[PDB]
């Protein structure tokens, strides 16, 4: 259960830091206990006898200075190491988290965990850890030194550490439990206004905007606002520790003033103890001050535990023995679902793709085809599956052989911030500049770089980069063609307007001599006349397969799709 823990460089340079931060507290306890003989002398008849006890207080202050200086210089270096060792754990964990974890909220959480945790990881040990754990032990060490001096006031000060710490934990629990009701009620209020603004064009164009405004307005106007419940939520979190600390002082000062009247203490040294009781109560107030600084840190570093406890996928040993030949891909009763309330469902898919063949996958929208491709790539695991390639189940391979088998052209092309020729070399960073020469003359991007200001070395991450969505899908085709794995999984782009990106995938299939086993999820019609068997998938199940001579003559689910795709290409908006 990783949360924000420390590095793995040393253990004797982390246990001698606690023994230093603890001596930095013993120094402050001795500096406070030395006030009894000093103030007891200043209030006596020989006040010049307080020079001896100012000498020792100077000795105890110059020691606390040194101990607080080394404890901070070490706490800064321990924040550096925590930052370094934590930012390298999120970045090493993210490539293993299961892909269905990256929902809309988890992506925001995980991007905050990387982008917005920098400066509060270095400023953690010196800003929150030592000031908090020192202020918590200080009154307990002060109370222990009083027992040789006045055991009544010492015992009454041991009794008060648990009560004053409970009053600090409870007033923070109350203050936190009310601030969640506060931003829950505000959300429950302003989510009708967020909807009224989302569906605005639909309302004004339907002449239905003023009645919908009246509805949201009257509901908003009443809502009962539920306010005083949250008042009762808010008050104790404001009053609890202040009442507790004001009440502990009364008790500790009436105990000291009573031990005088009876004769236990004399007045001079009864005041030296009232001065110490006040100093004993300052750490508790200092802990109450860095309550918001602790809540903000807790929230900000909960996003790191959110990532480090996210579910990871598990891979076997595998060692893809003889990947060489060409793999014969086979599904077996595979059934998949991200979960079961809504999403691309799949169940009963079972085929066998012969090795070295182009296979198209057509069907209704129902994108359990972008899922059939992910199950082959290995990006998703089946729930009742055994996807097995070249005879051997994929889930029984270590994830550096489980990825050395499939080259993929995704649907939405992704390029990272960098030059055009380092996006392509991400596939095979050791390509011998002829693999680069024909990964680009196949992808039809040789012209695109010989028509570009500086061409090849154009930074293409995200600046607009003069590259449109359709020609940013010709560098993905060049990347995927470079990497020489014996499986090519193309997921055609919905992008029209191409006139070149079509011939790109056409030439990727029909021209490439690498001799892999290709599988395309095709929307176009020209990239289906190259496949030698089609898989029509409906409702997450292969309803028919075969070549386009027996599907067409079958007059069934695919001849209709053929006819429709031929008619949806000679369509023209007309007046008539």
């Amino acid at each position: 259960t990783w949360i924000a823990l420390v590095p793995n460089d040393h253990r004797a340079r982390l246990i001698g830091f606690a023994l230093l931060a603890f001596c930095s507290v013993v120094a402050r306890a001795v500096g406070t206990v030395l006030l009894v003989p000093l103030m007891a002398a200043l209030f006596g008849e020989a006040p010049q006898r307080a020079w001896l006890w100012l000498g020792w207080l100077s000795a105890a202050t110059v020691a606390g200075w040194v101990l607080d200086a080394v404890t901070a210089r070490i706490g800064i270096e321990l924040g550096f190491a925590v930052l370094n060792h934590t930012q390298h754990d999120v970045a090493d964990r993210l490539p293993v988290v299961r892909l269905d974890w990256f929902t809309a909220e988890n992506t925001a959480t995980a991007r905050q965990a990387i982008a917005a945790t920098g400066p509060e990881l270095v400023g953690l040990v010196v800003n929150l850890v030592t000031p908090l754990t020192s202020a918590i032990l200080l009154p307990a060490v002060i109370a222990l030194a009083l027992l040789p001096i006045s055991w009544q006031l010492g015992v009454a000060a041991l009794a008060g550490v648990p009560l004053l710490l409970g009053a600090l934990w409870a007033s923070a629990a109350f203050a936190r439990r009310a601030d969640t009701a506060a931003d829950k009620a505000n959300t429950a209020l302003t989510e009708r206004i967020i909807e009224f603004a989302r569906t605005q064009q639909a309302l004004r164009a339907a002449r239905r905007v003023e009645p919908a405004r009246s509805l949201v307005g009257n509901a908003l106007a009443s809502q009962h606002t539920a306010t005083m419940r949250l008042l009762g939520m808010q008050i104790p979190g404001q009053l609890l520790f202040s009442i507790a600390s004001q009440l502990a002082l009364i008790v500790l000062a009436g105990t000291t003033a009573a031990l005088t009247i009876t004769g236990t203490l004399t007045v001079p040294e009864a005041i030296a103890l009232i001065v110490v009781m006040v100093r004993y109560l300052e750490p508790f107030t200092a802990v109450s001050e860095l309550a918001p600084a602790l809540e903000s840190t807790r929230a900000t570093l909960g996003r790191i535990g959110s990532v480090l406890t996210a579910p990871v996928m598990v891979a076997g040993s595998g060692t893809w023995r003889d990947g060489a030949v060409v793999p014969r891909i086979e599904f077996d009763d595979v059934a998949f679902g991200y979960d079961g309330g809504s999403g691309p469902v799949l169940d009963g898919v079972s085929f066998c793709l012969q090795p070295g063949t182009t296979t198209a996958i057509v069907g209704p929208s129902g994108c359990g085809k972008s899922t059939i491709l992910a199950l082959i790539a290995g990006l998703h695991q089946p729930t009742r599956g055994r996807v097995l390639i070249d005879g051997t189940d994929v889930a029984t391979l270590d994830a550096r052989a489980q990825q050395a088998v499939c080259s993929v052209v995704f649907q939405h092309p992704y390029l990272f911030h960098g030059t055009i020729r380092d996006n392509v070399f991400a596939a095979d960073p050791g390509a011998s500049d002829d693999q680069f020469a024909q990964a680009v003359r196949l992808a039809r991007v040789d012209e695109l770089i010989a028509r570009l200001p500086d061409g090849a070395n154009t930074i293409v991450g995200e600046a607009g980069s003069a590259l449109s969505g359709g020609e940013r899908q010709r560098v993905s085709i060049a990347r995927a063609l470079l990497k020489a794995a014996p499986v090519l999984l193309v997921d055609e782009a919905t992008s029209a307007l191409d006139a070149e990106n079509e011939a790109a995938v056409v030439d990727a299939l029909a021209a490439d001599p690498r001799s892999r086993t290709r599988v395309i999820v095709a929307h176009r019609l020209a990239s289906i006349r190259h496949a030698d068997r089609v898989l029509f998938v409906d409702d997450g199940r292969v309803v028919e397969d075969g070549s386009i001579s027996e599907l067409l003559t079958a007059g069934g689910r695919f001849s209709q799709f053929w006819r429709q795709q031929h008619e949806a290409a000679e369509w023209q908006i007309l007046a008539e």
Binding site: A72, R73, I76, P95, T187, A202, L379, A499
Partner: protein, 571 residues
């Protein structure tokens, strides 16, 4: 100074309420330092002999102070909520009636998170500013100011010495705030560079799992960032420790003790007057460095108060001009753009004196390169924005002189941005006519080729559509096309990219559009110029104005820009 500004105009009714709040939260924080003033009177009574009856009258005073400081704080914390709930309620009713009046194109210039970031986050930041940040910023200033005034009347000689550790701290902190002139904007550019990097790394996870060497860029941008942080902070450590050792209470305690020992032992101090400093003077550095921390809590509230007041100030669609003259020739469907000019930003025009003219019952296509201004020219007819220089008029009447209901009862548009409302699936097909007998809701969903798909719904037509419904963008589009079929606006604005935005359901969308665009005046934002070759009038335009104009058969004769877009491969 505090005038005529955004946050100053929004937070204008909370002037007397916040003044009373500050006055009441000053007493609340003064009744918490008064116990230490009672402790010094209790000490004086011990010193001065007698007690045991005069020492109960101080405990009575202390419990009275406890009680009256709890009452005052409980009254403040509920005043600050009663007075904030009313403001939030009245401010939501202003945002609700501002959204209904903003120009419609505004909602497209933003996103969907940019609206939540203003309706939820900026209204919660104000609630927190009113209930926490303001009562904390008053205490954070009154406590040290009251302590410093009480300690100077007790003894001015020892209260002067408490400025040693303050001058020593302020010298350092400035010697340090100019060693980070560059690196405090460098670290702000790095913090926004490392955010796009995280976004891209998270968005490109699949690729990174297929091609392992695609994360090298991110993993080397991260070692540069967490190396910059170290090279920035590691220097200025022997300054941050030094300025921290000068505010510790163990430092103030030594000064107080050394200065009080000199004055008492030489008989000029009366040691009962050194007790105020022992009680309240050692924690005096924390208070002065908490002043700034308390004043810095208003920044994130005033930013929200400014972001709300600029939005409540946004110029909204013109009211309407004089219901002027229908210009003598135009049939109820005729549309005339007349010398229109328009630009989003006030100096960069996107349209220049376009003067086309649609006709009743005809199709008209808008071709051009990307970023040419045809989508803008189209949505200018739906009054998404107002035209700066020219004047449009559908049916003979300027669209500026038309009520919002009479404009959309005459101009309809099928763009992208499907936008189904929350409700029954028959409540969306019959949005523009909410009393359709449900036989017309069926005859109109059978024409948009969405009837058999809605019979395959849990309850059928009575299904309550939501964020997750099981409908692709190509069947959420045949719903808004069915709705538009019931609207019957005689002038359609068709975005031709809605057909092929979902390739599977792309032959049924074309059969829905074949019915929606019948017997009416259509204006197509063409993207593929083979669909529009039988349009009545094709119009080319390049980054602004209109270049060429005519039918396809003719426009192909007089070569230029149209033959040049035509023969470009497809032909």
């Amino acid at each position: 100074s505090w005038r005529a500004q955004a946050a100053s105009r929004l937070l204008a009714p909370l002037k007397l309420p916040l003044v009373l709040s500050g006055v009441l939260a000053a007493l609340v924080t003064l009744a918490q330092l008064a116990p230490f003033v009672l402790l010094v009177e209790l000490s004086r009574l011990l010193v001065s002999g007698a007690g045991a009856h005069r020492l109960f009258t101080v405990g009575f005073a202390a419990v009275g102070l406890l009680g009256t400081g709890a009452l005052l704080a409980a009254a403040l914390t509920l005043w600050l909520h009663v007075i904030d709930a009313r403001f939030a309620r009245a401010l939501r009713l202003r945002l609700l009636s501002k959204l209904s009046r903003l120009p419609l194109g505004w909602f497209t210039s933003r996103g969907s998170g940019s609206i939540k970031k203003l309706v939820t986050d900026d209204t919660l930041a104000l609630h927190y500013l009113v209930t926490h940040a303001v009562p904390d910023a008053v205490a954070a200033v009154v406590a040290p100011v009251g302590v410093l005034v009480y300690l100077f009347v007790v003894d001015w000689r020892v209260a002067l010495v408490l400025f040693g550790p303050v001058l020593v701290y302020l010298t350092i902190t400035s010697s340090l705030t100019i060693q980070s002139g560059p690196r405090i904007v460098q670290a702000q550019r790095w913090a926004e560079k490392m955010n796009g990097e995280a976004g891209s790394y998270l968005e490109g996870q699949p690729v990174i799992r297929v091609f392992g060497a695609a994360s090298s860029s991110f993993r080397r941008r991260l070692d540069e960032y967490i190396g910059f942080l170290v090279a920035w902070q590691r220097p200025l450590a022997g300054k941050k420790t030094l300025m921290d050792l000068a505010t510790r209470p163990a430092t103030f305690l030594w000064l107080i003790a050394a200065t009080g020992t000199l004055l008492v032992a030489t008989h000029r101090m009366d040691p009962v007057n050194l007790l105020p400093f022992m009680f309240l003077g050692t924690t005096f550095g924390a208070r002065l460095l908490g002043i700034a921390y308390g004043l810095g809590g208003l920044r994130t509230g005033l930013l929200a108060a400014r972001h709300l007041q600029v939005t409540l100030d946004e110029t909204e669609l013109a009211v309407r001009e004089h219901p002027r003259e229908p210009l003598d020739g135009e049939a109820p469907a005729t549309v005339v753009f007349d010398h229109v000019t328009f630009g989003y930003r006030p100096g960069v025009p996107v349209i220049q004196d376009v003067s086309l003219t649609l006709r009743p019952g005809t199709v008209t296509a808008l071709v051009g390169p990307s970023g040419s201004g045809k989508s803008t020219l189209a949505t200018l007819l739906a009054r998404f924005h107002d035209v700066e220089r020219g004047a449009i008029r559908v049916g003979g009447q300027d669209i500026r002189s038309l009520a919002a209901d009479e404009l959309y009862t005459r101009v309809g548009f099928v763009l992208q941005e499907a936008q189904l409302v929350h409700g029954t699936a028959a409540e969306n097909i019959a949005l523009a006519v909410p009393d359709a007998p449900a036989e017309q809701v069926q005859v109109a969903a059978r024409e948009a080729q969405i009837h058999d798909r809605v019979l395959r719904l849990p309850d059928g037509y009575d299904t309550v559509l939501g964020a997750n419904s099981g409908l692709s963008g190509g069947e959420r589009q045949r719903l808004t096309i069915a709705r538009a079929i019931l609207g019957d606006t005689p002038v359609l604005i068709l975005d031709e990219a809605t057909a092929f935005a979902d390739p599977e359901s792309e032959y049924l969308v074309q059969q829905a559009l074949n019915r929606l665009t019948r017997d009416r005046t259509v204006l197509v934002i063409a993207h593929r110029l083979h669909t529009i070759t039988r349009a009545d009038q094709i119009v080319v335009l390049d980054h602004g104005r209109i270049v060429e104009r005519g039918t396809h058969e003719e426009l192909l004769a007089a070569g230029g820009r149209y033959c040049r877009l035509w023969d470009t491969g497809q032909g």
